[PDB]
Scaffold this motif. Structure first.
Motif, PDB file in Angstrom:
ATOM      1  N   UNK A 240       6.412  59.141   9.218  1.00  0.00           N
ATOM      2  CA  UNK A 240       6.598  58.655   7.872  1.00  0.00           C
ATOM      3  C   UNK A 240       7.514  57.439   7.865  1.00  0.00           C
ATOM      4  N   UNK A 241       8.616  57.462   8.620  1.00  0.00           N
ATOM      5  CA  UNK A 241       9.504  56.310   8.556  1.00  0.00           C
ATOM      6  C   UNK A 241       8.849  55.018   9.102  1.00  0.00           C
ATOM      7  N   UNK A 242       8.076  55.159  10.168  1.00  0.00           N
ATOM      8  CA  UNK A 242       7.316  54.049  10.732  1.00  0.00           C
ATOM      9  C   UNK A 242       6.341  53.485   9.681  1.00  0.00           C
ATOM     10  N   UNK A 243       5.602  54.351   8.980  1.00  0.00           N
ATOM     11  CA  UNK A 243       4.712  53.881   7.921  1.00  0.00           C
ATOM     12  C   UNK A 243       5.474  53.138   6.833  1.00  0.00           C
ATOM     13  N   UNK A 244       6.690  53.600   6.556  1.00  0.00           N
ATOM     14  CA  UNK A 244       7.505  52.970   5.537  1.00  0.00           C
ATOM     15  C   UNK A 244       7.879  51.568   5.947  1.00  0.00           C
ATOM     16  N   UNK A 245       8.294  51.419   7.200  1.00  0.00           N
ATOM     17  CA  UNK A 245       8.727  50.103   7.684  1.00  0.00           C
ATOM     18  C   UNK A 245       7.547  49.118   7.742  1.00  0.00           C
ATOM     19  N   UNK A 246       6.416  49.621   8.217  1.00  0.00           N
ATOM     20  CA  UNK A 246       5.149  48.867   8.242  1.00  0.00           C
ATOM     21  C   UNK A 246       4.776  48.377   6.841  1.00  0.00           C
ATOM     22  N   UNK A 247       4.849  49.289   5.883  1.00  0.00           N
ATOM     23  CA  UNK A 247       4.542  48.982   4.480  1.00  0.00           C
ATOM     24  C   UNK A 247       5.502  47.952   3.931  1.00  0.00           C
ATOM     25  N   UNK A 248       6.791  48.183   4.158  1.00  0.00           N
ATOM     26  CA  UNK A 248       7.811  47.238   3.643  1.00  0.00           C
ATOM     27  C   UNK A 248       7.586  45.801   4.087  1.00  0.00           C
TER      28      UNK A 248
ATOM     29  N   UNK B 212      -6.843  44.916  -0.854  1.00  0.00           N
ATOM     30  CA  UNK B 212      -6.375  45.608   0.342  1.00  0.00           C
ATOM     31  C   UNK B 212      -5.064  44.883   0.713  1.00  0.00           C
ATOM     32  N   UNK B 213      -3.999  45.651   1.055  1.00  0.00           N
ATOM     33  CA  UNK B 213      -2.693  45.029   1.264  1.00  0.00           C
ATOM     34  C   UNK B 213      -2.646  44.063   2.428  1.00  0.00           C
ATOM     35  N   UNK B 214      -3.582  44.189   3.377  1.00  0.00           N
ATOM     36  CA  UNK B 214      -3.730  43.182   4.423  1.00  0.00           C
ATOM     37  C   UNK B 214      -4.885  42.219   4.152  1.00  0.00           C
ATOM     38  N   UNK B 234      -3.862  45.448  -8.101  1.00  0.00           N
ATOM     39  CA  UNK B 234      -3.494  46.814  -7.657  1.00  0.00           C
ATOM     40  C   UNK B 234      -4.200  47.074  -6.349  1.00  0.00           C
ATOM     41  N   UNK B 235      -3.889  48.209  -5.702  1.00  0.00           N
ATOM     42  CA  UNK B 235      -4.438  48.527  -4.360  1.00  0.00           C
ATOM     43  C   UNK B 235      -5.478  49.652  -4.395  1.00  0.00           C
ATOM     44  N   UNK B 236      -5.551  50.367  -5.510  1.00  0.00           N
ATOM     45  CA  UNK B 236      -6.435  51.530  -5.566  1.00  0.00           C
ATOM     46  C   UNK B 236      -6.134  52.438  -4.399  1.00  0.00           C
ATOM     47  N   UNK B 237      -7.178  52.945  -3.721  1.00  0.00           N
ATOM     48  CA  UNK B 237      -6.926  53.791  -2.558  1.00  0.00           C
ATOM     49  C   UNK B 237      -6.573  53.018  -1.273  1.00  0.00           C
ATOM     50  N   UNK B 238      -6.526  51.682  -1.347  1.00  0.00           N
ATOM     51  CA  UNK B 238      -6.518  50.855  -0.139  1.00  0.00           C
ATOM     52  C   UNK B 238      -5.190  50.766   0.629  1.00  0.00           C
ATOM     53  N   UNK B 242      -5.260  51.920   4.416  1.00  0.00           N
ATOM     54  CA  UNK B 242      -4.714  51.045   5.482  1.00  0.00           C
ATOM     55  C   UNK B 242      -3.707  51.807   6.343  1.00  0.00           C
ATOM     56  N   UNK B 243      -2.814  52.563   5.709  1.00  0.00           N
ATOM     57  CA  UNK B 243      -1.884  53.386   6.479  1.00  0.00           C
ATOM     58  C   UNK B 243      -2.623  54.385   7.346  1.00  0.00           C
ATOM     59  N   UNK B 244      -3.727  54.902   6.828  1.00  0.00           N
ATOM     60  CA  UNK B 244      -4.563  55.843   7.581  1.00  0.00           C
ATOM     61  C   UNK B 244      -5.136  55.185   8.841  1.00  0.00           C
ATOM     62  N   UNK B 245      -5.686  53.999   8.674  1.00  0.00           N
ATOM     63  CA  UNK B 245      -6.276  53.247   9.808  1.00  0.00           C
ATOM     64  C   UNK B 245      -5.222  52.907  10.841  1.00  0.00           C
ATOM     65  N   UNK B 246      -4.090  52.411  10.356  1.00  0.00           N
ATOM     66  CA  UNK B 246      -2.941  52.098  11.198  1.00  0.00           C
ATOM     67  C   UNK B 246      -2.485  53.339  11.980  1.00  0.00           C
ATOM     68  N   UNK B 247      -2.318  54.444  11.277  1.00  0.00           N
ATOM     69  CA  UNK B 247      -1.992  55.727  11.901  1.00  0.00           C
ATOM     70  C   UNK B 247      -3.018  56.169  12.924  1.00  0.00           C
TER      71      UNK B 247
END
Ligand SMILES: [Cl-]
Lengths: 255, 255
Positions: A240-248, B212-214, B234-238, B242-247
């Motif tokens: 979760x913290x990694x996702x937070x930093x990525x998002x920020x 999409x945020x990217x 807005x981002x909707x589900x995106x 994106x966090x899902x793909x990154x993860x």
């Protein structure tokens, strides 16, 4: 037929005994849980800190236990792989009550630590903690489920202010927790290969380390960890913290 | 209380009328919400799809509305900036009851779409949908709150199988929704600059696009969207996706 519960527990316990290094990524909701199953992992962990941050609370048994168990139940319903839940110090519950609740929520493992949040962060005596784990193992045995009780000690994190030789205390505590019927141990706060080796070598059950999903662990890279004999890797709050930093960093493009 | 809520709503509504380009990142829990406030945005959106996926449900009004409002309440409590909530097609509530409930949860904006999930995904008639929006505006007006009703139409997304010329339908619908008292409009499903420009030009309120945020939008990146006159992003589900793909990518290193 057979409860899914008992099947999942047997699998989880068998995997712990196998000698393989088990990676059990640490989730906080059904979305993150789904990602772990889709990625092919054989089980997962639920982190108390990341659940609390995502549900309007904070770590250290600030959550309502019943609310937390409601999140666990959704997670265990959402995936078909075994789930373990960090229950902090036990939320002031008896070991048998604690086991009854996590089973009801569909979980087949727990972490229990020795800093007691409902008692001013009192550090349990080493045998007092092993006895708590022993009573939890008793309850799991009575329920007929191979619950993977991951006995956590905060000794290394508590440090020289609490213990003259924190590593010696950590070793003592994981040995006692193994003798009490823990199927894994979790001496948190490690940073060196020497610490890891000493702890791995002290017990026959898995030793759990906490990794950052990108940065890994201070003791060395993943091949090094495997070579040291580490058998359980979880992420604690750090996915979760990694996702937070990525998002920020990415949000800076937008405002 | 109601004073703070009215103040939040008035700021949100004023921001919409100002001409500023408003980026309102789309969250699904208190954790994501906090990140938005920390990142310096002036409001945020709550996405029905990402909340459902994070709470053991799915999009299309499969969530229990009370349970959803409980998540909304946690989010509005966690941040001090205006919050808007996607309430899908209204969950079969009267417009007045819908507004009552979103206000009780602390929100000061809503999205309402024209596919009625409780009526086998029937598409509302164009004036029928506008009338629903008007009745919601009337209810907000009676409550004395400047709720930002973002009237959504799925016309372009439904496409030519439903509306032979879906852009004519979309333009008609956003104009009717503005007339009905929507403070923003949201013709989802857009992919080209031609579409975005003609919808922007059709109304004097903001037009919302999903980015999409990217990867931005089909019509371009933020600067390009701004030059086309887009006033709400807005981002909707995106963001969640994106966090899902990154993860998913990073989890491969541990698998
Ligand atoms: Cl921590």
């Amino acid at each position: 037929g057979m409860s899914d519960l008992k099947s999942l527990a047997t699998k989880f316990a068998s995997d712990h005994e196998s000698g393989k290094l088990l990676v059990l990524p640490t989730v906080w909701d059904t979305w993150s849980a789904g990602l772990v199953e889709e990625a092919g992992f054989s089980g997962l962990t639920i982190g108390s800190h990341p659940v609390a941050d995502a549900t309007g609370s904070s770590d250290g048994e600030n959550m309502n236990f019943a609310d937390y168990m409601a999140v666990v139940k959704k997670i265990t319903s959402a995936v078909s792989i075994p789930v373990s839940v960090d229950v902090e110090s036990g939320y002031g519950l008896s070991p048998a009550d604690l086991i009854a609740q996590i089973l009801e929520a569909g979980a087949v493992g727990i972490n229990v630590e020795d800093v007691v949040h409902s008692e001013g962060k009192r550090v349990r005596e080493a045998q007092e903690h092993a006895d708590y784990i022993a009573a939890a193992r008793q309850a799991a045995d009575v329920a007929g489920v191979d619950v993977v009780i991951n006995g956590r000690t905060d000794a290394v994190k508590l440090g020289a202010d609490v213990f003259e030789d924190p590593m010696v205390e950590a070793i003592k505590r994981i040995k006692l927790m193994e003798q009490a019927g823990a199927r894994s141990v979790y001496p948190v706060g490690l940073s060196t290969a020497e610490q890891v080796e000493r702890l791995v070598d002290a017990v026959s059950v898995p030793v759990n380390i906490t990794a950052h999903p990108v940065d890994g662990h201070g003791a060395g890279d993943l091949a090094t960890l495997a070579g040291l004999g580490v058998r359980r890797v979880t992420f604690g709050p750090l996915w979760q913290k990694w996702l937070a930093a990525t998002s920020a960093q990415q949000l800076k493009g937008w405002a």
